[PDB]
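Methods, example record. To illustrate the input and output format used throughout this study, we show the complete record for CD44 antigen. The sequence lines were provided to the predictor; the line carrying structure tokens was produced by it.
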Amino acid sequence: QIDLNITCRFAGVFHVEKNGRYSISRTEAADLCKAFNSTLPTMAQMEKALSIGFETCRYGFIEGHVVIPRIHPNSICAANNTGVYILTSNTSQYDTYCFNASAPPEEDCTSVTDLPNAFDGPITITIVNRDGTRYVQKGEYRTNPEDIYPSNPTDDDV
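The corresponding predicted structure is encoded as:
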């Protein structure tokens, strides 16, 4: 009864959103990334994407740390802070970041970016279309390929 959403991929880095709000655990983060042919980010990768366009007012989980890059924040943030900030996550779960190698070194918001084996488990997930704006969900023309070749010949003799 849970859904996920994959936003743009900045230099391979991206955050996995949920149907509602952020609710991803650390131990689950790894599985999440790997479940999408991706792997947990790093300490430098995060601060690196900061200049690529990864503005977020919510820290995340990485290979082994917790950072929160800020570019063009607002008054809603910590006194309109800036740059990158490191701080553990004692509170409950939260968003999760992932880094992919398949995607290009720049912002990627198109096809050619799905699960490693393309499987369907007890959890749904969708990615952003080519327009790289608003991901699609519960759309039409989404029927899996499956045909049958029933061999039932016939004959008749006098």
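Annotations derived from this record:
Helices lie at 26-34, 43-49.
Strands lie at 2-6, 13-18, 67-70, 83-86, 96-99, 123-127.
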